[PDB]
Amino acid sequence: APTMPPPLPP
């Protein structure tokens, strides 16, 4: 899985 955190909902 991605090592970057997921963006917040707009």
Add this chain to the structure above:
Amino acid sequence: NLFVALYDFVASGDNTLSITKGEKLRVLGYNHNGEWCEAQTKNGQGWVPSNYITPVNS
């Protein structure tokens, strides 16, 4: 486990997948804390944010 995209999300590396609002997808799995969801759409497979999708069926 059918879900639908709540918002647009553009892929940016790390095997992420671009999705458009309203698009249907099958959830294949999650990462350790459920923040990332591995999905399959008509366009392909890859990771999308779990907070950007919602379940279909009730």
